[PDB]
């Protein structure tokens, strides 16, 4: 079986680390819910 335990509130943190770029990618979503690069 599985279980869940609470890990925090859903809040925006004003003093958060910014990172990560912003790529524009051509992708395909197959019937099994998997993305693929096209």
């Amino acid at each position: 079986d599985m279980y869940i335990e609470r890990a925090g509130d859903i809040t925006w943190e004003k003093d958060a680390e910014v990172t990560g770029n912003s790529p524009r990618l051509d992708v395909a979503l197959d019937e099994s819910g998997d993305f693929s690069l096209v």
Binding site: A7, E17, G20, S22, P23, D26, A28, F35, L37
Partner: protein, 152 residues
């Protein structure tokens, strides 16, 4: 145990207590990604949560009710990934999403890499609304990860 918030999804089937994914509890409904639970029932203390809606192509699944998360990325502002990695405390990561361009339309994407068990951590807009779930993405040339902002 049903107060709003982000939750870890744990299993005891392997060695020790493993975290297979993350979820969002809102309006009495628990939201996560299909590949996390694959539709299995979940324990929340004494009570049991049973699947209500699922869709393998969307890679989403609801518990105790219909999907309730309807906020969407505005396509301009930065967003925050409330990442909940296995064994580590929740951490907000701000970023400017990218774009998955698909035959049927464009979806926001976040280029943040995290352990497999982070699947399901919510993504928030500046007003705190959950705009999607992190987990369903791709791997690019460099070899690291780009996740869609999967919204129901």
């Amino acid at each position: 145990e049903t107060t709003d918030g982000v939750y870890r999804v744990m299993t005891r089937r392997l060695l020790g207590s493993t975290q297979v994914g993350v979820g969002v509890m809102q309006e009495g409904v628990f939201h996560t990604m299909w590949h996390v639970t694959k539709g299995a029932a979940l324990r929340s203390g004494e009570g049991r949560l049973d699947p209500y809606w699922g869709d393998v192509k969307q890679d989403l699944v609801s518990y105790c009710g219909p999907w309730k998360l309807d906020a969407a990325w505005d396509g301009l502002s930065e967003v925050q990934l409330l990442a909940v990695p296995p064994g580590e405390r929740a951490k907000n990561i701000q970023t400017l999403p990218g774009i998955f361009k698909t035959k049927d339309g464009d979806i926001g994407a976040v280029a943040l890499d995290y352990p497999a068990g982070t699947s399901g951590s919510p993504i928030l807009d500046k007003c705190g609304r959950v705009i999607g779930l992190y987990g369903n993405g791709v791997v690019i040339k460099n070899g690291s990860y780009v996740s869609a902002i999967t919204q129901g």
